[PDB]
Amino acid sequence: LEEISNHQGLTPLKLAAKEGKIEIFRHILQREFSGPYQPLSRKFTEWCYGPVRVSLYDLSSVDSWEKNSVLEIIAFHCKSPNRHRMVVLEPLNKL
Amino acid sequence: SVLEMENGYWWCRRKKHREGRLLKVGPDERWCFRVEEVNWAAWTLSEDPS
Amino acid sequence: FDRDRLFSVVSRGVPEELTGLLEYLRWNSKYLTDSAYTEGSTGKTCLMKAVLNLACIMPLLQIDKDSGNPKLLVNAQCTDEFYQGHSALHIAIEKRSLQCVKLLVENGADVHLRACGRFFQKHQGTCFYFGELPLSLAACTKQWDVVTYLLENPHQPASLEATDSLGNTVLHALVMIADNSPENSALVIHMYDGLLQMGARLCPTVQLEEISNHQGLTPLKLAAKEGKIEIFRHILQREFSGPYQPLSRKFTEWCYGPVRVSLYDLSSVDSWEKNSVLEIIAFHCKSPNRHRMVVLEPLNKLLQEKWDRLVSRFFFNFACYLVYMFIFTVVAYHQPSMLLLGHILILLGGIYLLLGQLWYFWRRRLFIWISFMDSYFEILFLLQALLTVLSQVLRFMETEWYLPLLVLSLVLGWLNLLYYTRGFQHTGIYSVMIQKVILRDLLRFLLVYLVFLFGFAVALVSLSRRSILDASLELFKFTIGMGELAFQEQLRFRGVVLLLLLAYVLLTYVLLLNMLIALMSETVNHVADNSWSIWKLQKAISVLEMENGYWWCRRKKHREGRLLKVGPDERWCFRVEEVNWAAWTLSEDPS
Ligand SMILES: C=C(C)[C@@H]1CCC(C)=C[C@H]1c1c(O)cc(CCCCC)cc1O
Ligand SMILES: C=C(C)[C@@H]1CCC(C)=C[C@H]1c1c(O)cc(CCCCC)cc1O
């Protein structure tokens, strides 16, 4: 479902970035589920050794390697006033 | 700035290297990004730390 | 019977799927600890994988008994440099499986194995440091049951005084994992207190707190150096009940109604002994929250009497420098009878400050590097003393260039007088993080202003065509409020020069005002400290150096406190009096 694009060629994740909907954008970007819905998640844990925990965020449409990525959409194709609050998200801030 | 700068100069376009590592979540392979966090209150895909 | 097959069976956890494996080892004369059956990349063995995929453990250890294995796999060690030293016992403790720990320990597992891998070091990247021993792992993971079992098991008790590769003990490990977080502070404080109580029961003749690592720091000293204020405060202000009374550091001398007097133990805190907590906090600590360390209840009071007892010496130093600077000014003003005496004092005064300042840098060199802003005035005094002596040297070795250096030393000598202003309140804003930020921007603003000043001056010269020096000076007069605005009618591009000059006026007003607005935001987004933590830190640094005495006359240090038998044990305690109207002793009567 997430790879379906509308007439503008934007996925639901990409559409949230362009329209400035930070609330749904953060939830989609940092999403995890249980065993039955494990392949439906975007955040995964690689290993956990006590307090130290490592997470793996899916850079499907986020990384700027592919054209019309989330980073390009947020920085240049977004007109919402709260553009700065988009990049401070946990996977975007680190990447 | 970094998004424009990574595109390269006009006289020499630079190839863009994908950031991340291809991991089989499980199959399905996704280019994930490694982020490390420390939590002292809460008490996995791989088997051993790396 | 195969390496791939053996690891697959242990993951499932069904011992019935592994039959005849022991017979296979006898046939091939191979052991489970051999490199053939290990993972090879990191030395991981079958037992290690079994604990990771948490019954098969007992038969797997049982079949080790049949084969003539000289080396026990229960004490196997990883071989990869990244993850070296990690054993199966470490897995059970990490997985929070008390039953697995009991099963492993009962079968001869060693409790003193060292996990000296790169992952277990205090790296700047991915790492986790819990000492280097299994006992430290349980302490840092909120496992009191595992700690209790590892301390009171008849099979192989774990010693509390065991040290890691750096000499860190169990108490040291709790210090290095502190992060001043509310969740982490409760973790370290609760376990540190519990281990001390268990330590008295297990080893009463061994004092845990006096054990020092390879750097020679006690756990109390280590907390001060590493900047862990949360555990530092708890250790410094510690009291217990009757059974653990000798294990406390804070005691009550007498209580008469609301008036209560407390006695804090100055064991490693008072500066009488070398490498004390006060010396460590002020000079050997690089943590940003150094000011919050001295405002603690025993440290805040103790540093006050040292300042009060030595305040006269501080003003005597101020008076001596003030008189010396007055002598310097008079001699310089009339440098071109008693003037011969004046030059002798200038040479003697410069050589006196130089030798005294050279002692300070000899005793300590890392302090200036780690914290430039803490002792930046030490550098300034060095330049003033060195230049003053050098300037008089050029007077004897006549080169006619001693005057510019003497004049430069005069203005800088008065600037060094601002150092003594730290002995008063002076209001302002007291912060070290802000001051570095403000200083950095002002220097950047000066560079931005100069290039704009230089850029416009060249533009003015070429368009009007003295040189750049006169034109740049004319533009700089605009800041001092002395600029020249006139329509020079004998210029071809008179309008362009006039418009360009007006552009500079509007440009420099924005630049100066922007810095004021930028400097205003720092003041607004600043929370004043009612205890004046920054000011107290500066006073604490000065008194510690001042009490050491001058270079020409070292002064004996008198210990601060009174020797009292707590009960026996005698500790040099510090008297602190407090008044409480809500709560309703060692001595018998008030005194
Ligand atoms: C307290 C602060 C933040 C003041 C407030 C505004 C002013 C003019 C500058 C700041 C400031 C420094 O940021 C640093 C120093 C001394 C540090 C070394 C200077 C060579 C003094 C100093 O007044
Ligand atoms: C402060 C300001 C805004 C003044 C205003 C006049 C001009 C342009 C110079 C500026 C300036 C620095 O931009 C920087 C310094 C030294 C940096 C540290 C000062 C404690 C002095 C100094 O006069």
CSV table of N, CA and C in Angstrom, one decimal, chain A residues 47-52, chain C residues 83 86 94 127-128 130:
chain,number,residue,atom,x,y,z
A,47,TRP,N,20.5,-5.5,17.7
A,47,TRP,CA,20.9,-6.3,18.9
A,47,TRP,C,20.7,-5.4,20.2
A,48,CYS,N,20.6,-6.0,21.3
A,48,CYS,CA,20.4,-5.4,22.6
A,48,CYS,C,21.3,-6.0,23.6
A,49,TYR,N,22.3,-5.3,24.1
A,49,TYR,CA,23.2,-5.7,25.2
A,49,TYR,C,23.0,-4.8,26.4
A,50,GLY,N,22.1,-5.1,27.3
A,50,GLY,CA,21.8,-4.3,28.4
A,50,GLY,C,21.3,-3.0,28.0
A,51,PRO,N,21.8,-1.9,28.7
A,51,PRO,CA,21.3,-0.6,28.3
A,51,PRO,C,21.5,-0.2,26.9
A,52,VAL,N,22.6,-0.7,26.3
A,52,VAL,CA,22.9,-0.3,24.9
A,52,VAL,C,22.0,-1.0,23.9
C,83,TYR,N,35.3,-8.4,20.4
C,83,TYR,CA,34.4,-9.0,21.4
C,83,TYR,C,35.2,-10.0,22.3
C,86,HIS,N,34.5,-12.4,26.3
C,86,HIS,CA,33.2,-12.6,26.7
C,86,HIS,C,32.9,-14.1,26.7
C,94,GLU,N,23.6,-11.2,31.3
C,94,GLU,CA,23.1,-10.2,30.4
C,94,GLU,C,21.6,-10.5,30.1
C,127,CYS,N,30.1,0.8,22.3
C,127,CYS,CA,30.8,0.1,23.4
C,127,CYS,C,29.9,0.0,24.7
C,128,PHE,N,30.4,-0.8,25.6
C,128,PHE,CA,29.7,-0.9,26.9
C,128,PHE,C,30.7,-1.4,28.0
C,130,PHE,N,31.4,-2.3,31.8
C,130,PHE,CA,30.9,-2.6,33.1
C,130,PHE,C,32.1,-3.3,33.8
